[PDB]
Design a protein around this motif. Structure first.
Motif, mmCIF file in Angstrom:
data_model
loop_
_atom_site.group_PDB
_atom_site.id
_atom_site.type_symbol
_atom_site.label_atom_id
_atom_site.label_comp_id
_atom_site.label_asym_id
_atom_site.label_seq_id
_atom_site.Cartn_x
_atom_site.Cartn_y
_atom_site.Cartn_z
ATOM 1 N N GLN E 240 32.541 51.389 42.162
ATOM 2 C CA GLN E 240 32.403 51.654 43.589
ATOM 3 C C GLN E 240 31.009 51.298 44.084
ATOM 4 O O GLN E 240 30.856 50.751 45.182
ATOM 5 C CB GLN E 240 32.724 53.121 43.881
ATOM 6 C CG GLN E 240 34.136 53.603 43.505
ATOM 7 C CD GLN E 240 35.298 52.760 44.039
ATOM 8 O OE1 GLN E 240 35.075 51.840 44.823
ATOM 9 N NE2 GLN E 240 36.510 53.001 43.552
ATOM 10 N N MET E 243 30.706 47.459 44.456
ATOM 11 C CA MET E 243 31.430 46.956 45.618
ATOM 12 C C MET E 243 30.673 47.235 46.909
ATOM 13 O O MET E 243 30.609 46.378 47.798
ATOM 14 C CB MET E 243 32.826 47.572 45.675
ATOM 15 C CG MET E 243 33.951 46.582 45.450
ATOM 16 S SD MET E 243 35.560 47.379 45.497
ATOM 17 C CE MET E 243 35.544 48.030 47.164
ATOM 18 N N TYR E 255 40.297 42.022 45.408
ATOM 19 C CA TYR E 255 39.602 43.300 45.446
ATOM 20 C C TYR E 255 40.552 44.412 45.035
ATOM 21 O O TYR E 255 41.723 44.417 45.422
ATOM 22 C CB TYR E 255 39.030 43.569 46.834
ATOM 23 C CG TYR E 255 37.868 42.669 47.172
ATOM 24 C CD1 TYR E 255 36.683 42.739 46.458
ATOM 25 C CD2 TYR E 255 37.961 41.743 48.198
ATOM 26 C CE1 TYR E 255 35.621 41.914 46.760
ATOM 27 C CE2 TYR E 255 36.905 40.917 48.507
ATOM 28 C CZ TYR E 255 35.739 41.006 47.785
ATOM 29 O OH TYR E 255 34.682 40.180 48.093
ATOM 30 N N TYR E 256 40.040 45.350 44.244
ATOM 31 C CA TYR E 256 40.850 46.406 43.660
ATOM 32 C C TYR E 256 40.226 47.761 43.955
ATOM 33 O O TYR E 256 39.008 47.881 44.115
ATOM 34 C CB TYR E 256 41.009 46.222 42.145
ATOM 35 C CG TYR E 256 41.480 44.846 41.730
ATOM 36 C CD1 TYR E 256 40.600 43.775 41.674
ATOM 37 C CD2 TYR E 256 42.805 44.620 41.396
ATOM 38 C CE1 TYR E 256 41.028 42.523 41.300
ATOM 39 C CE2 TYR E 256 43.241 43.368 41.020
ATOM 40 C CZ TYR E 256 42.348 42.323 40.973
ATOM 41 O OH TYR E 256 42.775 41.073 40.597
ATOM 42 N N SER E 257 41.079 48.782 44.027
ATOM 43 C CA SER E 257 40.606 50.124 44.345
ATOM 44 C C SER E 257 39.805 50.724 43.197
ATOM 45 O O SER E 257 38.849 51.472 43.426
ATOM 46 C CB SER E 257 41.784 51.028 44.698
ATOM 47 O OG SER E 257 42.473 50.544 45.837
ATOM 48 N N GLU E 261 42.748 49.361 37.910
ATOM 49 C CA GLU E 261 43.629 48.325 38.439
ATOM 50 C C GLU E 261 43.139 46.936 38.057
ATOM 51 O O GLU E 261 43.945 46.047 37.757
ATOM 52 C CB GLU E 261 43.730 48.455 39.958
ATOM 53 C CG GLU E 261 44.379 49.740 40.426
ATOM 54 C CD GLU E 261 44.227 49.956 41.917
ATOM 55 O OE1 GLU E 261 43.926 48.978 42.632
ATOM 56 O OE2 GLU E 261 44.403 51.104 42.374
#
Lengths: 151, 249, 299, 298, 298, 298
Positions: E240, E243, E255-257, E261
């Motif tokens: 996080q 990003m 883009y991934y959470s 993932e």
């Protein structure tokens, strides 16, 4: 001396590898310290003046009035309490530490006298001679007994 | 700086053997090579001074991602001291020495399609000095011997009369030829003349004088190795030897 | 609808992408520190009636002893600083300074290359767009203080939308006559002379009554991270000096009246967070340039 | 008749009535002196390679030795200085810091609490009123330089009255075209490009001819007694930082573009002399706020 | 017929191919070890009431002594760590860290360079495809727990085909109401709430009775070889942080959470076995980034 | 039109205004440090058979020697921590702990007592507003991950406006089927599964085709300044314990499932900058509460 090895064993080791070996054993003095440049001027009088620069003796900063290394007192205390050759040596850390404090006190006490002496010698050389002396080079070999006896 | 100080064929090839390719490649963005620009030279003129940037300047430039750019970056490093911006080449190629790229097939790089005339023109051979042209011709001969293009190298020399006169004489497979060679390839060195802390007009001349003045400081620095006074402290592997032979030569 | 925008916000040219690493940042800080010693030594030479202090400082700056009959320009350090300044301004400017020269000059004095120790306040007023109806006229003049003149010729009152961007911190609006301003979808307040606004609040609507023109004066303040050695007065003087000497004369570049306008214009462009870092180094370089030329003048 | 007035002169809000004693004035003087040394110790520290000059300066200011892994807010002095700036701006803002805390921080340095030894020049133009006839349009824009745009659509020439107040010492009037200006019940002279006036002389009458509009640019200079340490560059920077940091946000207050507009507006209010005295102390506190915050950005 | 797939499994962008050698793998592991020491140095400083533990920790990490008035950014190690993270995410991201700088930093400490000493369990559930007849609607929501909602509007019972891939070890299915699930040719069992499946067993057939919609919740576990110092709590925080800092801001990337993932999506892509090796080094790089940036926020 | 909003963002109650000074913040930091030593003392008492580590840890914490037949309650520090926690949650909760007791307990250890050393990432997604046309249905469920179910029963495609506030730094949207999203008054791109958005960019428009419903799963990351000792796992566990222990039952207070959504909800209210400062101190108090109560139940 401190890590209990021989020259042949550590012949191919690099500086960073050698630093790690000594630091793990407890020896902090593994770094070279840059000298502080002291700006110098000769008053003209009859001849035109000269401007030059020289290293302050004993790696002492005139602004801080102390050695360049700011952790010197902590480093010397680390050597005093350290154990280096437990199996084959006695009181190596205490003996070496006592020498370091004596060397540190003398250099801090007499750095102004030697700094003035260098400036006095620099004022005797004319500008033309100094420029020619810049081209030449040399290396001076000092016996280990004389260097320790000097400090 | 260190590459520009080498003055004999033996020292130049010895340095290239121990120098990896990553030293030739630069990781600074630089600028596009061929542009008409105005630079500031206040020591001489009040107005801006026109000049044209080039790949053999001492400052990094942007380079093409093809094999042509890689060879052109190697030669610019040898003759100017800096390379170009070619990123993402790969670990396998970058770890190899410069001599291995120029002389060995095991690297995995294919360079047999290269044209010496186009490479020379892109490097501005007309602007090069005598030492710079000799150094580039050494790179061409090593590439020709790797690819079996010895005949093509000789014909290219026949077309260019000035290049034939200064062409170094050595067989890229025999060490006896390298030892005998007496060509002076130094670009920087201790100057016999008066060298002053003054600027030069062109980009190439100004950048060259920076290396010349830097080499003088490097010569008196603690990093420089003085063979006369500290020969015993050098490691045996990298100590100077009369019977010094490059691997496979 | 008619759209009006500030002149200085239009089309910010890209800034250079070279000499932005730690080594180059150290060189700029070293040059600024040494240039300050140069200007102080010249004052000391005047007070002592001796050239020793000035020759002493010029030797450190230029690595050369001043000689008569040769013009004093700053040596190789001046050559590097002047050409690096040009590269910071525009991406079309060439990069011609070698890395060996930058490293050597950066080692002359001990100093940090930190460019985010402190902050500064910049007073350029960003008016990204002013949207007006058909029967109204809107004119925007000024950068430090922006006067927006609005005239309504229609039958009824018109609404003018003001967009001040998202970067400025506070905007103070003063009107020639009391006027009403409110955010989008908000009831209009009573007529007031002054409004304190947050640009992030959103587009602002102004009611323009039919009659005499209404003039709104706008002042803005924004915070940008700068090194502690930053001096706004010295940076602005250097910016005008660099313009007069022609260092900013590059193809396809935009010209600004002040460094305040230049830094705000680059901030409001896309990727402005990356542009503003380069502009800060340029400001420190211009401060060194201003002090260097004032110590060594040319008629 | 139409009346036009400067925007920044309208409705000055009441200022605070606390922290104006001798002990409180000493605290502001101490804060400015110790904050100045903080900004100078940072430069000296960078010139050398030791943080000792900054450590000594911060220890005196914050009553605590600086430590890594800490924000370095500024200690109790920074907190006390922030709260007094809030109290000065408005009478609605609460007075939080006790008098005992103010006295303790005032004893850190020995400085005089006098705030009226020196003077400073403020250049805001106080156009109190411009009275114009029926068929004339008058617009006033600006505070540092006030531009008055007037247009006459009537048949004959019109007389416009200018009132600059009684506080400003000098006012320089520059016109786009040469114009005639004279005092009340006085003959008009020949057309001139520039005029130098003393606002205490009285209201002035400007002849507005029929035709193209005439623009008059006004510049003023008022002297206000301030401490000797006063610096206009530092005070203005602190004023912007104060507004940006949101310590001027109080209900029922008036906001200004600069400290210069703030002080001239209060001077023209009812108790002008008393209001200005508090504002000068606010100016010195803002000067200390700017120097402290630039050295210690939080 | 209709095809439904998980959103995060769609189009995994290529990952970087640089800084994957043994020398660079030591650098990431060394950076993690030294970045951890910065975090614990804060607690040791409080116990000893001195900054000596932090000075030793920062000096080893950054190669310069900490100084006040200088923003502590981490030195050259922080710059190298930031850039290698950029190169790992995308193959088009330039690699601008010299190998000689990587080797110098890796010599600062001695660590085990093996990235396959241990393993970790990853919870992202892969639903490669759900095949449904014409008269039924299927919707897939969620990544950690996938809720599959199926509604039968046709006259007769329908068969829904579930494909969970081949990488996952086990998948647990839970339904809002009891349902029947079997293999391709196995007979249907009695309806029950939960099922435990091996994805390699084959496509699974679920009967969908007409009437109220049936919701199936899926949970999967996957084993990936990781270094022993791997910590999922720290990697997720670093993902996080990176990003938000814009380290992944490059064109033509997905883009991934969560890092969960990202690693599962690359595993199921073509050449997945050699893609997860790069992603594991990225995770350890992100673990070092989280610890270093929390200790030294910029 | 229709409007939908996140449930946890509705009506954030005012927070306490006591125990927010520097000395009180030191007490919270001291309690966290000493409570952590209580938990660590158990493991040290297992490596060495002695109970000296626990006796030393408990004596510092409770100012009394532990006894075998007497319940271990934590002493005066436990009572102070429990009452201080109640005060932070609501402004109606009484503040009954004397300041002389807080100052005495803050002197037990030397800690920074500073609240802004580091940061942390909070995963609550602030869907402030979803605006939909007449013939569409929108439902929002979830706080850590928000699923928005949209169905279009109209004749043509519908435009749905998404507002995520200005606080959150990044929002990642993944849909069950590819969908179209763009900013206000901007051309619309090709359909794709995932979008990365900056909430400050503006309201976002989603094209909703006529047919099968579209579900958008939202995840957000927000950075909030916290102490260096902040640990999210311990804070969340402490939050649940306080709710079960009755510390949060005050009249007219909102209730939240997690501390994550409590701090985000307060951040989106007016004067949310000031509210977060109090909430962060409550988090460290909850971190101390969890460790102390696990070591000394009831």
């Amino acid at each position: 001396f401190l890590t209990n090895t021989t020259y042949d064993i550590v012949n191919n080791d690099t500086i960073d590898v050698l630093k790690m070996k000594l630091r793990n054993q407890g020896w902090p003095f593994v770094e070279r310290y840059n000298a502080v440049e002291i700006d110098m001027s000769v008053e003209p009088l009859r001849s035109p003046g000269q401007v030059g620069r020289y290293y302050n003796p004993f790696n002492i900063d005139p602004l801080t009035k102390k050695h360049v290394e700011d952790r010197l007192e902590e480093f010397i205390n680390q050597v005093q309490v350290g154990r280096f050759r437990n199996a084959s040596g006695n009181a190596v850390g205490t003996t070496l530490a006592a020498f370091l404090r004596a060397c540190r006190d003398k250099t801090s006490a007499n750095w102004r006298g030697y700094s003035v002496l260098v400036s006095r010698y620099r004022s005797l050389i004319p500008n033309e001679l100094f420029e020619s002396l810049r081209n030449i080079s040399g290396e001076y070999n000092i016996n280990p007994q004389d260097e320790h006896s000097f400090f | 700086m260190d590459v520009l100080s080498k003055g004999s064929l033996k020292e130049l090839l010895a340095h290239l053997e121990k120098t990896p390719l990553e030293e030739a490649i630069s990781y600074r963005i630089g600028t596009v090579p061929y542009q008409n620009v105005l630079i500031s030279r206040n020591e001489y003129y009040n107005q801006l001074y026109p000049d044209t940037t080039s790949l053999i300047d001492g400052v990094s430039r942007e380079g093409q991602r093809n094999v042509n750019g890689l060879i052109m970056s190697i030669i610019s490093y040898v003759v100017s001291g800096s390379g170009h911006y070619i990123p993402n080449i790969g670990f396998m190629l970058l770890r190899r020495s410069i001599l291995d790229i120029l002389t060995k097939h095991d690297t995995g790089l294919v360079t047999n399609n290269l044209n010496y005339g186009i490479i020379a023109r892109n490097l501005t051979v007309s602007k090069m000095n005598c030492e710079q042209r000799k150094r580039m011709l050494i790179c061409f001969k090593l590439l020709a011997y790797k690819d079996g293009n010895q005949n093509d190298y000789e014909i290219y020399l026949n077309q260019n009369i000035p290049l034939k006169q200064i062409a170094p004489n050595f067989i890229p497979g025999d060490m006896r030829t390298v030892i005998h060679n007496q060509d002076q390839l130094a670009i920087v060195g201790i100057p016999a003349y008066r060298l002053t802390q003054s600027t030069e007009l062109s980009i190439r001349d100004d950048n060259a004088k920076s290396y010349k003045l830097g080499y003088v400081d490097w010569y008196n620095s603690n990093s420089f190795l003085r063979e006369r006074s500290e020969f015993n402290l050098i490691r045996l592997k990298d100590r100077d030897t009369k019977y010094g032979k490059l691997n496979g030569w | 609808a008619n759209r009006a925008t500030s002149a200085f916000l239009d089309n910010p040219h890209p800034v250079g992408v070279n000499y932005v690493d730690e080594g180059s940042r150290q060189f700029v800080a070293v040059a600024e520190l040494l240039a300050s010693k140069l200007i102080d030594s010249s004052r000391e030479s005047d007070e002592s009636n001796s050239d020793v202090p000035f020759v002493q400082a010029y030797s450190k700056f230029a690595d050369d002893n001043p000689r008569h009959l040769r013009v004093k320009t700053g040596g190789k350090m001046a050559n590097a600083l002047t050409n690096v300044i040009r590269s910071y301004y525009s991406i079309n400017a060439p990069a011609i300074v070698p890395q060996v020269e930058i490293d050597r000059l950066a080692s002359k004095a001990t100093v940090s290359g930190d460019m985010y120790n402190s902050y500064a306040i910049f007073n350029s007023v960003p008016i990204v767009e002013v949207l007006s109806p058909a029967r109204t006229t809107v004119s925007i003049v000024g950068s430090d203080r922006a006067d927006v003149t609005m005239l309504n010729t229609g039958a009824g009152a018109a609404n003018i939308t003001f967009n001040f961007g998202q970067i400025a911190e506070t905007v103070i609006l003063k009107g020639s006559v009391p006027f009403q301003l409110a955010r989008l979808n908000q009831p209009m307040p009573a007529a007031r002379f002054t409004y304190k606004l947050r640009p992030l609040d959103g587009p602002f609507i102004v009611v323009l009554p039919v009659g005499n023109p209404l003039v709104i004066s706008a002042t803005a303040a924004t915070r940008i991270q700068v090194p502690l050695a930053f001096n706004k007065a010295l940076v602005e003087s250097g910016f005008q000096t660099a313009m007069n000497d022609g260092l900013f004369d590059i193809q396809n570049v935009n010209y600004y009246s002040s460094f305040d306008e230049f830094i705000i214009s680059q901030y409001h462009a896309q990727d402005g967070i990356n542009r503003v870092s380069t502009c800060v180094i340029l400001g420190l370089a211009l401060q060194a340039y201003d002090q260097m030329r004032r110590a060594l003048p040319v008629r």
